[PDB]
């Protein structure tokens, strides 16, 4: 899949990659034991070969999802490819920037 930014602003795109705890889950979910996810833009290009990893239960889940994001400047096109383990984007965020601020952590 591909999206071309025609919104004259930067588009924040987010996705994930699923690392199951067992191979049974891998087969049941995606029907391949050799999985790849490719994300490509002119300023971001990364590839994923997620392998099984059984992990301690967090929220009662031995598996994980690694979360990833990037900015897509106008005119540029982002391309996803996968045979499994992809958590595709559904909504993205067309934003203009702003500059020089921070985050506050208080109960006021």
């Amino acid at each position, epitope marked *: 899949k591909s999206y071309a930014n025609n919104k004259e602003k930067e588009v924040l795109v987010l996705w994930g990659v699923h690392h199951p*705890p*067992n*191979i*049974g*889950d891998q*087969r*049941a*979910l995606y*029907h391949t034991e050799n999985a790849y996810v490719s994300v490509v833009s002119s300023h971001y290009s990364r590839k994923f070969t997620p392998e099984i990893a059984k992990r301690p239960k967090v929220r*009662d*889940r031995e598996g994980r999802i690694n979360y990833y994001w990037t900015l897509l400047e106008p005119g540029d096109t982002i391309i996803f490819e996968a045979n499994g383990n992809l958590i595709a984007p559904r909504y993205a965020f067309a934003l203009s920037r702003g500059f020089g601020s921070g985050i506050i952590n208080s109960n006021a």
Partner: antibody
Amino acid sequence: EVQLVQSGAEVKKPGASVKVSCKASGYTFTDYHINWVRQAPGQGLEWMGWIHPNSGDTNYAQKFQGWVTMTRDTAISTAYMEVNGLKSDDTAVYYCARGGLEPRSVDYYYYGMDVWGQGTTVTVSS
Amino acid sequence: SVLTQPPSVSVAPGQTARITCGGNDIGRKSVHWNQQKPGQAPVLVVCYDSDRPSGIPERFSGSNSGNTATLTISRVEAGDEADYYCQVWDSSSDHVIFGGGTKLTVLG
């Protein structure tokens, strides 16, 4: 109405082989697994495996790895269970099942068994 | 792994028949239950711990939690005398496992 119709009873002597058939009707034969489960006389259910008609991907249980061969055809909406090197303790009833219980969560993402065949009685005696 | 299921259970009509399916972390695996009357093939009665396929009386249900699942038959009748089996899918070994089964004896 979903229905699985299996082949007829078989009487074999040790060492022979069998090929049991399971012909499906009432749904698109390619959407769901075909599981195979046997039940020996008086004892309980023992799962043998599944084959997905669309991909041909197979899942064999450990006890049945190598002795058994699961296949399909798709054109006639039929799945096959071939057993080799038969022995008196292989005497049992062989059921096929449809993996049509679509999973509700990706936590337990398992296609459970909806519909069953009537069984195929296989007797192995010397 | 293994699923512990009591060999026999005795119950009187009009009562509530309660049956156990033992196992490790079975509460996160969502059990299914099959009814087998003698001379017939198995039949699905309870799916997903508490639910039913079309055509099953509402008095068939169940619960699942911790290390114990349970099938619950309210308002027991005589036509319910049969062998009951619980089944789960172990993702570790990628197997479908059954319990030893239970003979429900209705004292009529």
